[PDB]
Design goal:
part of a larger assembly; 4 chains; A: alpha+beta; eight-stranded mixed β-sheet; two-stranded antiparallel ribbon; about 15% helix; about 35% strand; C: about 425 residues; alpha/beta; eight-stranded parallel β-barrel; five-stranded mixed β-sheet; 16 helices; 15 strands; ribulose-bisphosphate carboxylase activity (chain D); carbon dioxide fixation (chain D); metal-binding (chain D); bacterial microcompartment (chain D)
Chain lengths: ~150, ~150, ~425, ~425
Amino acid sequence: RIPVVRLKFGEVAEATSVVVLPVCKAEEGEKKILEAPMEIIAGGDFKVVEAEKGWKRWVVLPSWNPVAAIGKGGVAVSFRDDRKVLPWDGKEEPLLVVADRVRNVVEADDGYYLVVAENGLKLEKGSDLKAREVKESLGMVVLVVRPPRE
Amino acid sequence: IPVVRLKFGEVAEATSVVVLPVCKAEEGEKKILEAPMEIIAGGDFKVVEAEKGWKRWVVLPSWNPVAAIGKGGVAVSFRDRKVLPWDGKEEPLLVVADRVRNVVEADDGYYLVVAENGLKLEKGSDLKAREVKESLGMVVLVVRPPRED
Amino acid sequence: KLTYYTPDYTPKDTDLLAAFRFSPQPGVPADEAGAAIAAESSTGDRYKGKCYHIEPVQGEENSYFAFIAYPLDLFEEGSVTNILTSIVGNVFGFKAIRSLRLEDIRFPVALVKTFQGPPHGIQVERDLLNKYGRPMLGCTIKPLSAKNYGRAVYECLRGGLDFTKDDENINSQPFQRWRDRFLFVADAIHKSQAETGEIKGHYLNVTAPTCEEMMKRAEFAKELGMPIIMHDFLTAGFTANTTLAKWCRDNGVLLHIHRAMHAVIDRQRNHGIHFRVLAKCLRLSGGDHLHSGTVVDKASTLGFVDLMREDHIEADRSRGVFFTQDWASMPGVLPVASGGIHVWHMPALVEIFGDDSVLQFGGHPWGNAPGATANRVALEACVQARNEGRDLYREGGDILREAGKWSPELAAALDL
Amino acid sequence: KLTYYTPDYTPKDTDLLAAFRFSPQPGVPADEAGAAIAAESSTMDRYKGKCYHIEPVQGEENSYFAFIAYPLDLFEEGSVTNILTSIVGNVFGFKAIRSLRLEDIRFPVALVKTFQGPPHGIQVERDLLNKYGRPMLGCTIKPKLSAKNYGRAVYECLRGGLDFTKDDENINSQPFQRWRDRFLFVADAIHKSQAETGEIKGHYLNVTAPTCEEMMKRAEFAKELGMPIIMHDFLTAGFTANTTLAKWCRDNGVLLHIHRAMHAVIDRQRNHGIHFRVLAKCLRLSGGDHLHSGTVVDKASTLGFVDLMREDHIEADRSRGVFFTQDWASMPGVLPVASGGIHVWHMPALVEIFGDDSVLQFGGHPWNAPGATANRVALEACVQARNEGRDLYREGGDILREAGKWSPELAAALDL
């Protein structure tokens, strides 16, 4: 289904590589996701970066391979509760969803695509969107990040 | 004070949330004196919280010096200085500095002071020779661009 | 981890120290990894090891050294096998480390004195063999029935070598049974000694499937008057090696140790046990001779050669010696150079190893006695030249060519 | 090179076959490298190995397999040590290869029959112990302490319900505890437990020793005291010593437990050294009734080992790590011992994975005897459930939760 890698406590000891994504929220809505800077210019040495647009909120994510692969068009969406967004079971915890707007076109039947739901923002299977003939989406979910816990 | 390539998987090491407000050298001490010191990852969303907003944000992967800084974290863009254009230009730079460790105590340790134009890095011994017992930040690491070759 | 990594600990004179190299898994800090090594290899308040120092490997990414002390009481007196299970038994399988290699061990005097050491050692061996002022020579017979084998031994020893060696893979096989090899070899030795007036021998292989068979073979070699025997310490085991070494002291028989299968555990540089550790372990267990191999990483090689010959070796990281090792007057072990060598390298071998060594050579254009002659001449020429201050690393070409003017056998060798 | 790589050779029923994995140095063809391995490991045109098949490792660059046959005549009857010097003595040090690993060996029946094999074997061992229908249980005593207090811990645990109690593998004889007293106090603990419970209980007394004579003395004393089983480290002590002890055990009726300390040094890295399945086969031929194989709670490789050391005949299956069909010619198997990271929550899986012919060695219970109780109950519950038809990989959680209500000792364990 959706690839889910959970951030864990104590992971701050030695990250060799890390990536940065702008942050959008369920309350902020689809508009914020359109507003977020897509191209983050890497003029980096050990990371120095500039963004095409100024953005208030930034999440620092480890260079997990799916997140690293995205590059441009990478965004993180904050959800207060996991259950509403996740088609499957939830742990009643805040959810971070990484989405690639570059692949927003629905081509992957099993692929999950962030879309604007009537209630708010939801992750929808591609096949389901194809059944409703929705050719485009906000972003294609690449990874779901779960919070550190005890 | 290590110099590390932005390399993914070389030392594989891997996973963390860590952030530094960025300053340009051209900006000078004023930008450093104003960048937000406390950058606190929390809640469960883990979106980082800064006591004050900053224009430019860069993160330095949680290598050991970066993790050690905590408060006072800052990143300083440095730009070169080629006599001959054909001679290859030196790469752009970034300095991870602990503003909390402003005081000059280590002769070996480099410290961030102000050049006539822009900022500069000076040895602790040199600063003590010049009678400056204070610096803006203490450099904890050195830069080098992601090289895939 | 705070009960194992103690940055401000000074080792005691009676502590055993070990130096490890490791590369920690992603997300594992070096100090935590070091503490774990100490815990896994010891209990895990006076029965635990302590990691006292951790430092990066210069030049190597994600690679660190850790120095760990272990209390004297954790080791059985006189036992190599106990020392090894305690230190290398399961630490290498530890999950937070990608790879682990053991570089060095400091054996405290208090522990060194509980071991027998070499049955005879360097000085005693020269006296027993009555051979002074030079390296010793030998070769391996390339090919046979026991008599034909015996003929080859005779010719090689008769021609001037000090020792002839059994192939390390021939113990007893349907094509040749050890009892006959022993009889025919012994005859060859006795004839050569009688005809030349010198002391000659053969490294009879007594490596065996059981300790009883090992003793039977060793006892037979003693009955036949053989001055030296051979054993494969890594394949056979330390219990068997130690046993044979005690036997050898009691019976006056020199012991030659072959190092077959060492590559299995020390070849790669990022995992396993460095040969110098095994070399120290062997010096404590027993054996008068130990293969070192040739050099013609000479720094690391020379490092262990001194560790197994000298009384006191100061730490020197550039030679791979991590700790200062005081051998407390235990006798040393002659290194044996071997593999890839011929008369062309004789200059180098003499200068590199000095006199306290054995040079084993692998054919000569005119058969075995000329073979032996050419090596004997080349060696004597090199030693005498060294004694006159000639620089064997540069003049070696002329030393051999000049020798070739008086010896047709050597010349035939130098022709190729 | 072309005298060794022979692409059109069919192995004989009497050939010893070996499968190696290697990575050649850049510039060196796979076929030439395969030929070289056969050459380095052998030699007279009947005394050479032949490389008969070379294929790439699927999914990897510069990674190949080579299959080499060796004539029966090259191997000393009954000797593991001769087989090993021949096969692994020097190939690992060969210059044209970056890395080399030995993956498998086919022992021809003609050679298998020259070995003793396990002293007693699985079926005999069950009959001697009078234990049927289930895996056996045990644990290692912690603190890993005087002989008297040690003996008390042993008594309580055996009395409490375990079949076996184990000595720490690193304690042979030390200033704080000497083997002779450990043996006396443990034997008392066993005898009281057996008298009280009516069952047969043992203890894996460590008889590992620095010399063969000492090893025998320890073993003889264990027999004098009526101990049914003893322990030995086959890798550190080595095969000459192991084989010797196994022979002693068969003659004297004592079961032999083999620990695998230091195997990580030899096989942890996937691209160099000797895979444990090879060592496991070698041990089955040398001796040992029980062998640590370790738990999994690579699964496929693990299952491979278990069949190789237990079945009479194993069909080749590369997906399970078995390269050659192996016929054991009615030699009895070795009972595998699972260990590492195990407690009652893993009991379901352990029973289903290994079946009945196994021993489970458990690590800490909140209440010694309550520990033994919790594991004894958990195991019996799992075995009964399996026989009834429950699926232990899914229902295991409920089987343990229900069992936990029968005995509060188990609940206490499950609660953590």
